Structure formats: structure tokens, C-alpha cells
Amino acid sequence: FXXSXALL
């Protein structure tokens, strides 16, 4: 969840 892991 929350995108790819780049930002979150």
C-alpha cells in the first residue's frame, strides 16, 4: 500500500 516504497 502507499505506492512503490520510493516515497512510502
Author numbering: 1 to 8
Would you copy out the relevant sentences from the publication that reported this structure?
Novo29 is an eight-residue depsipeptide comprising a macrolactone ring and a linear tail. Novo29 kills bacteria by inhibiting bacterial cell-wall synthesis, with no detectable resistance occurring upon serial passaging. We also report the X-ray crystallographic structure of a hydroxyAsn epimer of Novo29 (epi-Novo29), which may provide insights into how Novo29 binds bacterial cell-wall precursors.
The asymmetric unit contains two molecules of epi-Novo29, which exhibit only minor differences in conformation. An intramolecular hydrogen bond between the main-chain NH group of Ala6 and the side chain OH group of Ser4 helps enforce this conformation. The macrolactone ring of epi-Novo29 adopts a conformation in which the main-chain NH groups of (2R,3S)-hydroxyAsn5, Ala6, Leu7, and Leu8 converge to create a cavity, which binds ordered water and acetate anion. Although epi-Novo29 is much smaller than PSMα3 (8 residues instead of 22 residues) the epi-Novo29 molecules daisy-chain through intermolecular hydrogen bonding to form extended structures that resemble the larger α-helices of PSMα3. In contrast, epi-Novo29 exhibited no MIC activity (>32 μg/mL) against any of the bacteria, thus indicating that the 2R,3R stereochemistry of the hydroxyAsn residue is critical to the antibiotic activity of Novo29. Inversion of the 3S-stereocenter of the (2R,3S)-hydroxyAsn residue of the crystal structure, followed by geometry optimization of only the side chain of the resulting (2R,3R)-hydroxyAsn residue, afforded a crystallographically based molecular model of Novo29. The only difference in structure is that the side-chain amide NH group of the (2R,3R)-hydroxyAsn residue hydrogen bonds to the carbonyl group of Phe1.
